[PDB]
Design a protein around this nucleic acid. Structure first.
Ligand code: ANP
Ligand code: ANP
Lengths: 451, 474
RNA sequence: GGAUGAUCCUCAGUGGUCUGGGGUGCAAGCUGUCUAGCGACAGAGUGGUUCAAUUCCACCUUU
């Protein structure tokens, strides 16, 4: 949620930059001017409300014109009371007004995107105007057998029984791949565990009031599932509470330090989120439908950092994190290329996102496997997470960063497609440590490819 | 669900066994008097239906005879009378009526067929409603009482020694800096928790360990979905569970912007449930000897029963990982009851392997869930808390869930004799948080916690030997 | 029923826009509006009775 002073030309900022940054995001402006009107009205109405209460008190201080009052002392009892009761009608009306404006001003503010780093590409088309920054590994080789057939050929995936139980995209990951999953977990956990990231296991659902602070509408509409609880552990209570399953570990970790004052000294704080993530995936029908590349439920290990805003500690930590992931996917021997995402494809929170598109040889194309984002002070202001616990003056919030270390399932797929042979898939050297006796060497085929 | 025939007196079994089963379960036996009622009426509607069909054919037959006796005869308009009453008819009457009258009467029979169809459906539905909440048969060896603490019976004890220590799991989880209760209550509501740092590894160890243990003993590792469709969850859970355990999740039921419809799902409270639904509506082959599955899944409980119990730590939470041993077995040669006793020793050995003192218990009838025929509760000793807590449950549901999910013993050896369903059993290998609490109370020191030999292997470098305190106990 | 939430802390008092004693800081904290700035005004959990609520009452929250 951007600072309101950026809309006041009276105060520090200018909205013309906001508008421009909305256009760059390719979200229709106006929202900025709906904001500014609603705010300006709310100032006038908070000014009136003030002045009226100033008279409300002016009159008990004293104890036929009302538009504006002077140092009044003439008349009393009935003559003053009537005026004060008429003023009270005025405050009721200015109260209804204020509440309406406040609510609707913030309605507009809620869906205005964060500021953009200059380096971000300014276009709406992603295929065309996305820029690759770095390229690693062997990016042109191919192996023909896709991750679907591969996942089947190992006897690790039940897509039919998963469609029965959970209803399309639902799945039973079975046997050896479970150990393979676990490996990736353990490996990523140890990696980050060494680099000063503290591991953390999060809750999977939230209290809405909290979720609303960490998610934008779109996500509520086409991503977040909703949970319905009792909101009390008594049989007497037939009341209900709406909770929401998390789509990322970013969300629960972001809220971890809600409404706190974080000291500059302890401030560079790295969290290693461990969480299962539920997404409805309403955007994408008929996309990656067979395998487990794209599914409604999957474990994920995430890098979330709270950083100081002042210098460029945020954007150094950023470049560090992205490079962190790089070293992870370099170590498993996966070829990839880093891409800089266009302004249209950024979510409100982010100021800039660099994604790691890994090479899928069997499929013969580049699929996304890691995103990295710097939200700056956007989430922070909303979660009221400031910088230092109270000197004066001018309240400054932290900068918050979030990037995925490993998305267990899509990474598993990348492994399968890149390390296939004739017997099966070769286990990359890093994981051999954590793969059980028998798979340390390889992952053997036991089933044939479906036709 | 049970078998209807053992409700039917003219058929095999007796229903006074069932009413007795209820009395032992301390539930209502009047439920069965309702079952027997709706079944009786449903039979009546079956009988009439049949008799009615017979008549319909007899109308098409008498119609047959008309053309032979005369192409023209009598009157083609007149309406029928008295005959219509379908309780009692002949062929004489049908022979008397002209063609037209028999044709219309045939239509009235067809109307009455549809009326039966409807009413038959209503009875079937009501009988079922009665049947859902009727408990499985009890094994004699199960104790027969309602309260558990007084009338539970201990069968086995292992390990040392009803020993005591200090620092409950409540204080332990804090002292190691692995638990954030206050900020997790803010995020996820009451009882919610952030598990952090070292415990995360500890948990991951347990998982990794149990998974290799069972993965060695022939169990097939399996990762379940965490939510199930209404239909199927309804097949695997009972009403009280829906009221006081299963959270309700709501999806869109279609991945198109266009779609405004929603689909109601439910989050699982055990891996039992998605695994039971793995092989729904299937004929399990006799050759595939007891199929063993290692279920790895997080489990959501609303935990509505209990208010103000174990509120501080991670002992009772609304979300926790769990490893379950689930086997499909044969009902013949008491094979399930053997594997039952095997599976319990399996968990026994694991917890022996972790040096955790415990004792096996037979659970009383009055606390048993409908599905189970008999449940074994491995209760591990908490020195720091100073008591024994339920850590593991293993249950043999026999054919109950089986009958419900339509999972039969293959084609069976013979046909047209009686369809026999499989026996299915479910047991918890590891309850990560409760296990973690068990370990923290059993390996505690003053330096921190000692890592159990087996887990040392899976701990990351530096945490293989022990886990150090960093904070003081409140 | 008691305690509580936002006027430096603390005890006591009180319908007069708060008072007093003791302690602490500086030469009295937080939010918001107005003014170019100086600075002024409004807000004290929510409502009521009262012109007037720190008090009285209703009420809640956390405990
Ligand atoms: N349906 C899904 N199943 C599994 N992982 C997913 C899914 N959608 C997104 N992700 C994860 O999100 C990470 C990076 O993409 P992210 O930006 O988080 O979501 P996104 O941009 O919506 N990706 P997509 O929706 O697949 O184009 C990947 O490493 C994936 O693991
Ligand atoms: N509130 C809870 N939090 C975490 N795990 C639980 C909880 N309740 C039960 N379990 C797990 O499930 C098994 C306990 O017995 P089970 O029969 O599944 O549930 P239960 O008998 O209802 N136990 P409880 O609900 O604590 O009285 C153990 O493996 C537990 O760790």
């Amino acid at each position: 949620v951007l600072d309101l002073d950026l809309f006041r030309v009276d105060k520090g900022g200018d909205p013309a930059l906001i508008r421009e940054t909305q256009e760059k995001r390719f979200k229709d402006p106006g929202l900025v001017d709906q904001l500014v009107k609603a705010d300006s009205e709310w100032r006038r109405c908070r000014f009136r409300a003030d002045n009226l209460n100033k008279l409300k008190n002016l009159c008990s201080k004293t104890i036929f014109d009302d538009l504006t009052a002077d140092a009044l002392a003439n008349l009393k009892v009935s003559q003053i009371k009537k005026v004060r009761l008429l003023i009270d009608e005025a405050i009721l009306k200015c109260d209804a007004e204020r509440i309406k404006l406040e609510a609707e001003r913030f309605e507009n503010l809620r869906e205005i995107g964060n500021l953009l780093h200059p380096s971000v590409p300014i276009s709406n088309d992603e295929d065309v105007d996305n820029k690759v920054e770095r390229i690693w590994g062997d990016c042109t080789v191919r192996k023909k057998y896709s991750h679907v057939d591969l996942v089947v050929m190992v006897d690790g995936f039940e897509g039919e029984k998963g469609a029965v139980v959970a209803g399309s995209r639902g799945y039973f990951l079975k046997g050896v791949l479970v150990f393979l999953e676990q490996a990736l977990i353990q490996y990523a956990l140890r990696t980050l565990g060494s680099r000063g990231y503290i591991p953390i296991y999060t809750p999977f659902f939230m209290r809405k009031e909290v979720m609303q602070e960490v998610a934008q509408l779109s996500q509520f509409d086409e991503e977040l599932y909703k949970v319905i609880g009792k909101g009390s552990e008594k049989s007497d209570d037939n009341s209900y509470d709406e909770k929401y399953l998390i789509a990322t570990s970013e969300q629960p970790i972001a809220a971890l330090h809600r409404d706190e004052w974080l000291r500059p000294e302890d401030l560079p704080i790295k969290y290693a989120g461990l969480s299962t993530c539920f997404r409805q995936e309403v955007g994408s029908h008929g996309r990656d439908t067979r395998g487990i590349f794209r599914v409604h439920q999957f474990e994920k290990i995430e890098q979330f950092v709270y950083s100081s805003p002042h210098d460029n500690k945020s954007w150094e930590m950023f470049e560090e994190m992205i490079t962190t992931a790089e070293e992870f996917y370099q170590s498993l021997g996966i070829p990839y290329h880093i891409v800089n995402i266009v302004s249209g494809s950024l979510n409100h929170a982010a100021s800039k996102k660099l994604d790691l598109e890994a090479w899928f040889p069997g499929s013969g194309a580049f699929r996304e496997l890691v995103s990295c984002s710097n939200c700056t002070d956007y989430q922070a202001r909303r979660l009221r997470i400031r910088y230092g616990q109270t000197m004066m003056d001018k309240v400054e919030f932290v900068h918050m960063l979030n990037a995925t270390m490993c998305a267990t399932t899509r990474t598993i797929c990348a492994i399968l497609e890149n390390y296939q042979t004739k017997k099966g898939i070769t286990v990359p050297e890093k994981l051999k440590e954590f793969m059980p006796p028998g798979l340390q060497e390889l992952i053997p085929f036991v089933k044939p490819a479906p036709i």
